[PDB]
Each structure stands twice: as structure tokens, then as C-alpha cells.
Design a protein around this ligand. Sequence first.
Ligand SMILES: CCNC(=O)[C@H]1O[C@@H](n2cnc3c(N)ncnc32)[C@H](O)[C@@H]1O
Length: 210
Amino acid sequence: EVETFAFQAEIAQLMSLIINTFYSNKEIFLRELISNSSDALDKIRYESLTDPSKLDSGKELHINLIPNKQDRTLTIVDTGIGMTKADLINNLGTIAKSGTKAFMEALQAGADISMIGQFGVGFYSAYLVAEKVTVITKHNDDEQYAWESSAGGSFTVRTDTGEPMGRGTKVILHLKEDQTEYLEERRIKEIVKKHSQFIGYPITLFVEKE
Ligand SMILES: CCNC(=O)[C@H]1O[C@@H](n2cnc3c(N)ncnc32)[C@H](O)[C@@H]1O
């Protein structure tokens, strides 16, 4: 039921640099994931202009931030375009249209990790704070899939049943033990205000029930 894949070599190298470089300004991961969500929302907004039935899977365009202290997870949910199975494997597993090469060269020429979004690889900044990342996604043209990786050079993809989402993507960050500050309401609010205050879709920060 589960397929296991190797990252393209350059992607594994990039992930290793992100995981092993001493770099304290880890909060920038959230900006990068929210920007990726905003881009995905732009895409379905545009496609629905000439094909309104693409919103049959949900008209609302928004971003949800869901902390769970019991599971030690932070989840970033959007109702954007979503990804097909091929999209997951290509976009997360290979260089594809990213600036992976430019970023790694830039780091050797005076750039720092906070500039990762300039190079189209902001998603991998999740590994600044997460030991494992799970991506659940549903595109209008495919079934629901789950991508997962704890780095180390490989990732898995499986069909995801139970809790079907209408359309969009959930990025589930299983946080490192010493990065639980990013589950705290005050900290998340601070980061969103600092780095994501002009995003063109509603960002809702969920409250914990306990
Ligand atoms: C890992 C670096 N590559 C990407 O992030 C690409 O993966 C896709 N992607 C990333 N996040 C999302 C998302 N929330 N929704 C849809 N596609 C995404 C986009 O095509 C990105 O350009």
C-alpha cells in the first residue's frame, strides 16, 4: 500500500544542510508554508474563473493553523489547488522547477537560510523545526494522497482514506522535542504578524480544546 522513494541527490543534500547547519532563526518556516498555501489558493482561484465547477469541492479559500500540544504537531491547512500523486513525487522529491542549485550556491557565497523562499524551496524549511513532515493532499483530478518523510534520503507516498478533505493540502509538522514553542498561541500570532500580515486569504489560528 506504501511506496518508498529516494529523494533526488541534490534535494537530499539540501535537506541535510537545513537539518545540520547551526541556524537559530527557525521561525521563518511558517512564512514559507503560508506563502506556499497562498500560491495554491491563487491557482484554484484563477482556474475557477473559467471553470466554476472546480469549486464544487469547496468555494472557501482560506488557511488554517492548527496546533496540537498532545500530538506535538502544528498543521498548516489550505483549500488551494492541491497536488496529484505525480505532483507530490515531482515537486517534493526532485529539483523540478525549484532553485535548489541556486540556493546551495548562494549559501556558499554569503546568503543565509532565511533567504530560502527566494529560491522556491521554502517547503524544506519545515525541517528546521520538524522531525517528520506529513503532507495530505487532494486535487480535483486525483484521489487523496499522503506523502511523508523524516528526511534521511527517502520519502513515502500512499493513498489516504478516512477523513476525505474536499480539496487542498495539509502540511503536518511533527515537531522536534525542543521546538514546542511553535505550538504556543502567542508565538504563532507573533510570527504571523511579523512575516505574514499581508497574505490575501484569511488565516485562522485554532484554539486548543483543553
Ligand atoms: C519543495 C519545493 N517545491 C514546492 O514546494 C512545490 O510543491 C508545490 N506545493 C508546495 N506547497 C503546496 C501547497 N500547500 N499546495 C499545493 N502545492 C504545493 C508547489 O508546486 C511548490 O512549488
